[PDB]
Structures are given as structure tokens and as C-alpha cells.
């Protein structure tokens, strides 16, 4: 057995200088009856860097951590890490952590994202390259760039018939300009590519469906 | 102040031939105490005339007791007769012991396990720890028949495993047939005894536990697995079972068993002849000297409770006031009454009602005191 | 006190070892610490010794090689230890082939500090190792089976036949007198063949003898070969009492030759089963003078025919044949009633390593269980037996059954050694002996004696060196079966004189009041230094404390006594109870060891042995705090009505733990009592919160500080006392996490007051 | 101060075993515990592995890694190790050794730099670069988008630039994804239509694992 964690929300949309508040809850009490301390720890991780210790006990900060972070979160089963005024350096992922009993478990984490005004995706479609056909391979790629928020869905259709197999969607990522991007592939053989006359990709976002096509 | 009540005060009675025996009164008394204030409870004990007796014979069957067994084979009827002079319903039993069946206590060469006697022409028994033979019965013929069917055995070292037999006899109540009457165990031997710790010589490390281990045919089969009883364990078991030992031991072993008797509160020691010819007189002398001592003792007191006794052997006796921890009167004649003054005081208020059991050692009767406190 | 009962380590229950004793060991070179445990022989593990370490938060055990391997029953296993190495002893049984006796003594192995074999010793036939002048250095300034084939042919008239029966009866009686292992069978033959009684019936000599007189004559033709065949088929088999390893004999008693026998003699004699049967032919009657019957007799008998074939004039002459047959059939049994001496000496019953070469071994069964000790030199392989001087025979018998050598120990004086031994049965209450040396003669004498019968005084010994200067200061003697109500036990603490080495009682120790059965004192051990004061600390066991109560989940305890400059503590500093350690522990506290660091903290630890399991207890750091305080103003001026600044700083004055560790997870909790003792106080805390139940986390350094303010009490100040010093009391306390924590949390020094007082 | 170093990334075929390392400096190596945690991609977060106490060699394992990991320590070299047995394609993750806070309780007060393990049977294969010719309809807009497809390369990484790195805006290098057993990647740039095809547009793809550099000019 092991203590379970529910760290929600999975992500928070925040703006510089605005109060923020995470939350995770534990399936068992963390209040060690003797020392009366709650055995929960908070970590911070910047993309591409090892995690760091922020708050060891439920409300005790580590040396070097700026005061704007606060542990709070009493009770023994519900905890909340609060930031008085978010800043750019604070953009990352935070995990809360069991410390009272074994096995030791984490809460999955919560990622912060800076808020930006909505931006419709810029969609472009490129047919298979000429040289790929001489290798008996064919693939169709659609690029979706500079859109906000980062949630979108795409549906591929060849000759108006949706295809649900043979696609690989590149991981959406966040840019320094506070925008997102994405891509999708359409694995096909050269023989299979010539079986059809026209192709099209569909994009779903907060608005009206946007499409492109080839032939 | 304090208070004291009587719930049962059934009059003393020697008891009709069918029922009515009562030798201790009162039987139920309620005491309430304000700490620092003493209260004096009165108790009185009457020595009935024909009180029943249960006798269990426990004989050492080592080889040196071969001559002894020949006489015991024929003393059942006489022993029954002599006890019938002092009591109206006597019954007798029998059991034996030699030692544990492991080296160095007993020779484990298979031939000597089949025949421990020095020569192959005489009757012999394989060594055993304890063997219950005859349950208590009122028939001397059964005693003569079963004892006559026994034979002597042998072991390797002088001390014998009789403490096993004593403890098993105390613990095994239903098997041996004990009644709620005067219980007398006659332990007869010619050598000293083994005690806890000795078993380590034989590779035994599990101490004796207080459970009856006799099997379907009255044999302590699991003897080699457990260690000998300690002296304190035997004393405690005899006290709990209310059995009175009478050690009939030869002259060489007399001092050891006198020292042992001092530790066990009610017991007697006598000199057993080399042939065991004087067993009946030994039993009778011990029994008479044992029933003429009336001793009153208390169970474990609650915390902060104190108790004292002032024995009174006759009505006009003085008030000495000595703070003895256990009343006792000696040379109590049949058909007589004595009196103990049990004084009770306390220090702290108890958290709940407590109970005491003041029992005349050697008899079943008892006196439950329901002790409370106030402030 | 110092021992961590919240984090025990246990050997798996029902695991490979059924621990009988546990023991800590350390190789002085590699500094590796093991946990040696013992076990009886079982099908799972031949035993007797295993070395166990802490692998995966559990105790895992592997056997130690080059140790003697017991066979069959568990006779006894003994193990001791010193910085010179480890000694193992096993009681072994050797059944001497010739006679009906047994020898019970030990076989031993002396391993080095790293458990590599160094020496071995077998103690059977001890008189060949002995040396009554070896210097006692003390730093001086299958039996026999017989089958009889009786001829019942009618040619024997009834008188001669009663004589033949009498011959058989006298033969049986005579043979049993000088051959205890002999067994008999009787087959009467003729027109028919008839087992009178097989070897099984011979186990009751009287009944078998009776059966002989009960025989009835068949009186018909002589079928001798069929009689031999029937003895071969029916008498000499495992189904009728015969034993494979036992000798097999025949005695044929015939008065004439074979005539009209359906079988053939030469095939019967040559039969595969006959090989190994010693046939004796007894011939009676005139017929045997003829050549043919003589040939038959020489054919039935086994050569040398002069010693196996026989002839007698008439059936009366049989009574004389007994001598020759008895010589030729039964081998002499030899002496069997000789004295015991070293036959059951049981050497290795106790043990003690004196130095790299010499060991001291107990010999409880030495002389009718008088006892003694053997001083063995494992390199020269020679030893000296030491015991109580016999003097006249009247005194030698008085020393029987004392069990001297039940326990052995060494006392270390400023300039010499001294060997002591235990005699729990001495005068039926126990005693402790000591080796007095006077030139050549060295012998044990009683120095201490018990008081109660059967208390087993002297069964356990524990010399204690309090300040670890190399000189014993106390001697602990146990009487585990001491009786008041049941068996409670007792322990006698004996002070050792620095001038004469004499003994003088200092104290009597008893278990917790409330248990009639505790067996207190059954196991004791000097556990090195646990409290970290550089004084030795003792442990005692009460394996029966709580036996049989309630569900009986666990019983047994261990008491921990701390040592002081004036000797052992008056009352125990700890009492570990089996029920608070784990479920299922039976007889917790019958073996112990300590003084070696097994957890990795660098602090000495403990091991307690259940009857079936081992337990290891981690010791805890002992922390002493130092309280300092400062005032501002340093003193209150007359009429002052302001606020007093206070700087309170605690410090770790003990070097037991590194500074960076601080107090680990324990929170410092302190309270301030201002102007203690006054009916109405003159000062009080600025904030009640700041001075009551103040919890703080240590700074991770060697010091912690706080700042506080005090203000005068409200209202006019009483004129009775206006300028007396104000007393401030700072009582502190450690709050340690509950549960099973990775590091052993600190414990405040029990023998230092947990507070300080300062004045203004 | 306290810091931890590690061997670095390791590529191993399925079914093998790997012995990672975590050197320690700046503290008494035999007084504190060393913990290991496994961080996996795809939202798997982190899961604790076990512990080891160098002062005594004593270990403890989460049941999920009971038979998988095996920790050990070297007091002389002040370096700990983890041994992973019978690695599978699922064991691919980044692992971290740690050092418990001296006071209080914080399992990972200090972390090592990072070590990444990939369990793949694919051989070292260079990439194949395919230009993405814009559709005929995209030539009429003010802004034109181009790109290339880096398909079929292993192991990671491959660095993609445009015009020998002179162009530094509008470049989007999406994270690579694996097909079958061989990785794939794409990159999209955007330049004014008034500059393409009127001016050369090219990309440079470097695959150090094969010492391969490929140049591909975009053509309509
Ligand atoms: C402490 O330990 C010492 C040994 O270190 C013991 O001394 C031994 O004592 C035993 C007797 O207990 C001595 O036994 C010897 O036995 C031999 C055989 O005697 C047999 O025959 C006689 C009858 O004739 C029987 O009583 C006996 O049981 C045997 O069946 C004899 O050879 C010995 O006597 C001869 O030698 C001794 C010693 O040289 C002479 O004094 C005698 O006059 C005679 O010549 C003897 O009886 C054994 O010899 C002793 N050994 C030593 C070295 O002295 C102590 O008994 C022991 N103390 C205690 C208290 O147990
Ligand atoms: C920090 O230490 C202080 C020491 O004073 C602790 O306060 C004391 O706590 C104990 C345990 O709860 C109290 O004992 C109990 O108090 C009441 C009143 O008598 C009663 O219910 C019980 O009989 C028992 O004695 C004690 O009164 C209290 N105060 C003092 C002055 O001793 C405090 O609890 C500690 N901090 C923490 C967080 O535990
Ligand atoms: C002797 O007296 C004792 C004590 O009174 C009796 O013990 C009883 O044992 C039975 C066994 O089933 C219990 O149910 C009773 O509760 C016990 N107490 C009483 C008061 O009966 C014991 O049975 C008596 N023995 C004989 C033979 O009468
Ligand atoms: C085994 O342990 C002992 C005891 O700690 C070590 O002895 C110490 O050795 C160091 C140098 O290594 C000295 O500075 C200490 O003073 C020694 N302590 C004592 C109490 O004498 C010994 O070195 C260790 N041996 C090995 C091989 O590690
Ligand atoms: C005890 O005395 C009473 C007095 O009535 C008597 O009936 C009873 O028999 C007594 N016993 C003897 C032996 O006299
Ligand atoms: C043999 O013994 C039996 C049984 O005791 C008896 O009946 C019978 O008469 C005896 N036979 C002879 C010949 O003595
Ligand atoms: C048995 O057989 C042998 C070998 O054939 C022969 O010599 C002998 O005479 C025979 N004996 C009898 C009694 O038949
Ligand atoms: Ca005897
Ligand atoms: Ca006799
Ligand atoms: Ca015996
Ligand atoms: Ca000393
Ligand atoms: Ca100490
Ligand atoms: Ca330790």
C-alpha cells in the first residue's frame, strides 16, 4: 500500500503580480502526533533542471527561497502552496511530497503558465517532398504555430474521409513570446499516397474550424 | 466513619452424613473504609469430626525401592482401614515416577531402555517420568490389584524426577479424581530430587508450563521436551490446588525434604524405613499433626491495603494485638472452635470495588470480602 | 532510557534459525560487526552457528563453516567470544562398541577474530590430554541371538526329555547371568517343526523360561535339516524380532541322525542365508560312535570342529557342557559397574577464552557430577583438571551433585587473574568457587553461598568493569529461581576489594513488583557503554515476566542498569517489555550482548535473544544542553518600571553528535517561570504565548538563541519584599516524532536536571 | 558546499543491466542517507525508488522496484551506485540521487545533475531530410511558411538551423517523437514572401551520433 495524492489543478493560468494558490490532498493524515508537524514537502522544477527544495515541513521555508512563497496548508490532509505575486522566474512545475510513511510518493505536479490574449493558429499544409517518393515513402505534415491557449485538436481527412490511424502529433510547447505551436504527421506508403486525389487537415480551437487541403 | 455488614453467616456445622459441612463463618462480608480508620472483622473456624480425605500415593520406583514395592503391594487395605478410623469417606489412589528418559539422567542404550535393572532375570519396567495408575477410589482391592501389577525400574543418577509427578498431579484434576475435600499427597522416595536448571545437562531448554500433559494412558509422554519444575513453581501449584504434601523419605534424604517442607506452607516430613514398612503410621501421624494446625491467609491485597491477625484459641483468651501477617492456631482439638480477628485498614481510595479471599489453608471453605472505600 | 524500542530488527519468525542464544562480535582488524546466533539441529539447518547482518531493514543469516556439526538430538550448544576469537562447543554422544555405557563430552572449535578455524579439540578419552603439573598462569607478580533346535524324536524317553528341558533352562539362566544382550529362540523339530518361542518372546526372561518347561514331545522321525531351514526362514528375520547387525548362533541338540527328511542337508547348510551363522552340534547317545552319524555331526557344526562339535555319553552329561559352550559362544562383556569419572564430564558445558591459546571449560559431570573445570592449551593440546580437593572419602561423597562448572568467569585484578566457577546445587542452594593457588596445588574453594534452597545461586556470572580501566569492580551472581510467590528471581551485586580481592555484598536486585513468575537474573551481560558516559552499563533479563496472561502475545523483559562511579544504579533506567517490541515473542530476555556498532551510527548497540528469535536495538544519542541567559539592564534600578530584555541561548555541550545534525526531527520545547516562589510575582512575561510551551526547531548548528521581554506586574508592588533577587526557571523538554524514524533521535541525559535557574 | 555528480546518459539494448553512479562531496559520506527517485516523461511525474545508508550498507526498496534496483555504496570513493537489472523499453527515464536534509525531514535536499537512460534496440542511424514545398495556394499571401522533415534518426539529438544559423526568428523546432523504434522530428520557419524564393532558404541538420551534417535548400 501507499499514500495517494491529488494535486490539482493540473496547471494554473496566472499573470505577473497576481496571487496564486496550488492544492494537493493526502489519503492519510500527515500530522505526526508527537512533534505535531505535518510531513509534507514542496518542490520546484524549471524545465531542463533538477528539482529544488522549497518548503520541507508544511509551512517552513528553506534558506534561499524568496519570502513570497508560503506553505500554509494545515489540517493534515489538505495543503496549499501560495505565491503572493507571481513572477517570471517562478514559472515552473511544483510537486508536493509525502514524508511520514513508506513508500514515499509525489503528487504528480502542477505547471504555471503566463496568460496571453487569445491567438488563432496559423495553419499551413505541405505535401510530401518530391525526394520522399523516390524512396517509396510518403508523409503529410501540417504545421500549427502561434496559438493560445495551448489546447487544440486536429482531425485528418483524405478525400473527405477521416483517418484515425497512422498519425503522430508533435508535442505542443510554450514559447518565450507566450504562445504555443504544434504539428501532426500522416505516415503513408508511396502506393497508398497515390490511391487518393486530395487531402485535408482540420483544426479545432475556440472559434470556427480552420482547414487546408492539397490535390 | 467506617461500616461493615454481613451477607452470609451460615452457622457452623459438622455436617450430616449427607450434607451440611461448614467450618468457616462468616463467608461474605462487606467493608467500607475511610483511610486511617481501622475496622476489625471477626472470623471463626470449627474443626469438623469426620471430614472426608482423598489420598494419592506417589512412589519412587527406582531400583533401590524394589523391597519397598513388595510391602506397598499389600498395604492398601490396612491404609484404608486406618484412615476410616478418623474419617467416614476416604479414598486412595496411586502413581509412580523415576526420571526423564534422556542422558545423563537415564541410560539410553536400547537394551537398558528395555531393561534398566542390573540383571535380566528380574521383572523390570522401562523408565518413565510419571505414570498415573489408579484414580482415587474407595476400594482397597483395586489398589492392591493395580499396585501389584507394577514393577521396579532404574535410572543413572541419584536425584529423581519426582517434581514432575507432583506438578502433574496438582495440575491434572479431572484425571486423578480429586474432590473438594481434604487432599493429601504422600510423596515417598529414597533420594533427592531434580529442580529446574538441571535439564540443561540433557539438552532441555523449554521451562515447564502449567498444563496437564498426561496422555490417554496416564503417562507424561512429553516429559523430555520440558524442564523440571522449580521449587517455587511446585509450591505455588500445590497452594493453588490446595493439596497438602507428606514427604515420607528415608533418613539420608531427610534434611533436604525438611528444607523443602519449610518453603511449602502446609506439609509434613517423616522418616520412611528402608523397607517402607511404616508408611501407614507415617501418614497417620502427619495427617493428625497437619489437621490440628488451622492457618488463615489472605489473597493478594489491593494497593495500599493492610491486614493483620490476632489468633484466639479459646474464648477467654487475651487481646495480644500482635500484627502477624497470617493467623494460626496449633493443637486444635476435634469438635472445637477458634477465632481470628482480621484487622483491615487502607491508605488510598480505590478506583473500583475490590475482593479478597481469606481461606483456611488445607480446606475448601473461603471468605469473600467486598472491600470499598470512601472520602 | 537510551535504547530505541520503536525501531527493532527481528529475525524472521519460523525462519531458518531457531535462536537459542544471540551474541555480538567484531573483527578488530576490519571493524566488521556480525550477530552470531545459535540453533538446535533441524532438518532445515544442521546448525549450530550462524552469522547475521542487517540486509534490507532485516536480519539475514548465513551459517559459519568449519564448526562441529551435531547429529540427532540437541545435547547442548555453547558459544563465547573475546577479541581473541570465538569458541564453539557441542555436546556429543559416543557409544563405545564394547560395553553398555555411553560417553557424553564436548567437541570444540576455536575460530579467529575473522571466523577462520584455528584449532579443534575432542575431549573423549581425557586422561590422555591431562597434565597434573601444567602451570596455571595468572599474571603472577546389535547383540547376540541364539536359536536352539531341540530334537523331539521318540527315541528320547520322557525322563531324558525332562533332562533336556532342564539343560536348555540352565543354559538360558547361565547365559543371561553373564551376557545382558543375549536373546533366545527355541524350535522343536521332528515329524513336524514348531516354534516354541521366537526372539521377541525372549525379552521376558521369566515367561520364556516357563515356556521351556511347558514343551510337549512331538516324538516322531528326525527332520533336522527342516528344523535348520525353519530357523533360517522364520527365526532370523526382521518380522520376528531379529536384528540385522546382531550375531546369530545355533545350538542343535539331537540324539540321532537324519532319516526320511524330505530336504537335503548339504543344500541347507550351503544355503545363502546360512553364511554368518555359528552352528554348534551337541550329540547325545551311543549312536554317534558310528562313522556316518559322526560325519553328519561334523557336517552340521562349524570348524574348528573340536570347539563346535560335541558328544556326551548320556543326557545326564549335558549339565557339564555348559562351561565349554558358554566360553565358545558368548564373548566377555567386560566391566560395566565401574565409577563414572570423566565419562560423562560434559566438557564445554561452559567456556571462557583466556587468551589466544588457553581456554577454560566447565566439567559439571566430572566425578559423580561433582564438577570442575579444564584449563586447556589449544596449541600444545594438553590440559589440567581443577576441582575441589577430595580429602577423605567422607568429604568426596558430600561434594557429589554440586554441578561445579555450570558457569565460569574470570576476574581481572590490578596485577593478576582469578578464575571463578558456579555450583548451583551446592548444599542445595548454590555457591561460587574460586581457584586458590599454593605452589603445585591449585583447587577451587567456596567464597560465596546462596540462602534459599533451589534458587540456583551461581548459575550466572557477570564481572563488571565500571570505568574500563582493566580491573573488575563488581560481580553479579544470579539466583533466577528465587521464590517468594512463585519463581521471581534475585541478583546479588558483590563489590570487589581493591586491596585483598575479597567480596562484600552491596545490593540485592529484584524485578518489577507485580509479577510472581519473572525468572529475573536468568541472563545478564555487560553491554559496554550505551549511555555514552564511558562507564559500563549492565543488562538483566526476566524471560517469564507476563507469561500466560491474557492472549499471551508476548512476555519477557530486559532491565538496563547504568553504571556510576559508586557502582551500579539502584533502580533500572529502562524496562523493555516483549509486548511493546513486536507480536509473538516468547521468553524475551534469556540471552543478551552489546557494545558493538551495527547500525552505522558509530554508537554501541544491543541484541536480545528470544527463545526462537533475535532482536537488535539501536541506541540513541544522549544530548546534554547548556542554558545561558543575559539581562538588559543587568539589574533593575530601584523604581524601574520599563521593560527588561532577555537573551536565552541553549547549546549542545555533548560531543555525541555532529553539530550539523542538531536535534534532527526533535523540537525543543521550553517554558519560563518568572519570579518563582513568590505569592505575587513582581515581573511577568510580555506575551504569555512567548513563554509557555515555546516550540522551536534547532538551527542545525551547535547553538540556538531567543529574545524575550518581561514587564512589571500590574498594580502597586507589595512592600514586604521589593529588592530580593528574581528567580527565572527555564524548564526544557524534547518532543520526538512518533513512529519508526530513520535516525535514532536524541534523548536528554537522564542524569542531568532538564532545567536551569538564573537570577536578576 | 554539497554537490552530486553522475556518470551521464547511457544507451543500452533491451535485457541488459546498467550501474549508475552518484559521487558525493562536501560532507561526511557515512553519516547521511542517499535516496534515488525516477522521473519519467508523459506526465508520469516521479516515483521513489529506495535508500542506502553508506555508514552501514543498509538498504530499503519500494515494492515496485524490489527486484529491479540494487543500491550499493563505496565509502572510500564516496560514490553510490544503482544497478538496474533486465532493463526494458519502459525503464527509459531520468534518475536522481539525493541527500536528506540534516535537520528536520526533507528526503531530497540536494540533487545530482541528472542521468538519462534509454533502452532501445535500434542501431545508430543518420537522419533523412525532406524539404516541405509550400502549396500553390500559399504563394499568394504576404507571409510564406517553409520547413523540413528530419525523419529516421537515432540516437538523439539533432540540431536544426536555417541559413547556417543566420536566421534566428520564426523557427519552431518541435519535440521529437518515436515511430516504431526510430525517432522523427520536424521544424517550421516563416519568412516574408518577398524574400522567398527570391532569396536562398536552407537548413543545416547535424547528427553528432553519426558525425553527419546535411544541407537541404528549399525549392517551390
Ligand atoms: C577432584 O579431581 C581429582 C582428580 O583430579 C579426583 O581424584 C580422583 O578420585 C578418584 C576417586 O573419586 C580416584 O579413583 C582411583 O580409582 C582407582 C580404581 O579404584 C577402583 O577400585 C576401588 C576398590 O578397590 C573402588 O573403590 C573404585 O571405585 C574403583 O572401582 C584406583 O587406582 C585409585 O586408588 C589408587 O590410586 C590413588 C591415587 O594414586 C591412591 O591414593 C590409592 O591409594 C590407590 O593407589 C583411585 O581410587 C582417582 O585416582 C583420583 N585421582 C587423583 C589424581 O587423585 C577427586 O576425587 C576430585 N574431587 C572430587 C570431590 O570429586
Ligand atoms: C511543551 O512542554 C510543556 C511543559 O509544560 C507542555 O505543557 C504540559 O503538557 C502536559 C501534557 O499534556 C500537561 O499535563 C496534563 O495537564 C493537565 C492539567 O494537569 C491534566 O490533563 C493532566 O493530568 C496532565 O498533567 C501539562 O499540564 C502542561 N503544562 C505544564 C506546565 O506542564 C506542552 O504540552 C508541551 N508542548 C506540546 C506541543 O506538547
Ligand atoms: C470443587 O469446587 C470448585 C470451586 O467451586 C468447582 O469448580 C467449578 O467448576 C465448574 C466446571 O464446569 C465450573 O463451571 C464452576 O463455575 C466452578 N465453580 C463452582 C462454584 O461450581 C468444582 O466443580 C468442584 N468440584 C466438584 C467435584 O464438585
Ligand atoms: C577500527 O575502529 C577503531 C575505533 O574507531 C579505529 O581506531 C581509530 O583510528 C583512527 C585513525 O583511523 C584514530 O584517529 C582514532 O583515535 C582511533 N580510535 C581509537 C579509539 O583508538 C580503527 O582505525 C579502525 N580500523 C580500521 C581498519 O578502520
Ligand atoms: C461436638 O459436640 C456436640 C455437642 O452436642 C456433639 O453432639 C457432637 O457429637 C460432638 N462431637 C463429639 C466427638 O462429641
Ligand atoms: C502349559 O501351560 C498351560 C497354560 O498355563 C497349562 O494349561 C498346561 O497344562 C501346561 N502344560 C504342561 C505340560 O505343563
Ligand atoms: C544331499 O545332496 C548331496 C549332493 O548331491 C549328496 O551328496 C548327499 O548325499 C545328499 N544328502 C541327502 C541326505 O540326501
Ligand atoms: Ca535410590
Ligand atoms: Ca529400599
Ligand atoms: Ca535419576
Ligand atoms: Ca575498574
Ligand atoms: Ca554508560
Ligand atoms: Ca549503533
Author numbering:
A (entry chain L): 1 to 102, 104 to 216
B (entry chain B): 81 to 455
C (entry chain A): 1 to 141, 181 to 799
D (entry chain H): 1 to 220
Text lifted from the article:
Unexpectedly, 3D analysis revealed two distinct populations of particles. The I domain is positioned above the heterodimer interface, which would completely sterically occlude the ancestral RGD pocket of I domain–lacking integrins. We found that the αE I domain makes additional contacts with the β7 SDL and a β-hairpin on the αE β propeller.
Integrins are heterodimeric proteins composed of a single alpha (α) and beta (β) subunit. Integrins canonically exist in a conformational spectrum from a closed, compact state to an open, extended state, with the closed state considered inactive and the open state considered the major signaling state. The β7 integrin family, encompassing α4β7 [Lymphocyte Peyer’s patch adhesion molecule-1 (LPAM-1)] and αEβ7 (CD103), performs critical roles in facilitating immune cell homing, activation, and retention at sensitive immune barriers. Here, we compare cryo–electron microscopy structures of apo and ligand-bound states of the I domain–containing αEβ7 integrin and the I domain–lacking α4β7 integrin to illuminate how the I domain intrinsically mimics an extrinsic ligand to preserve integrin function.
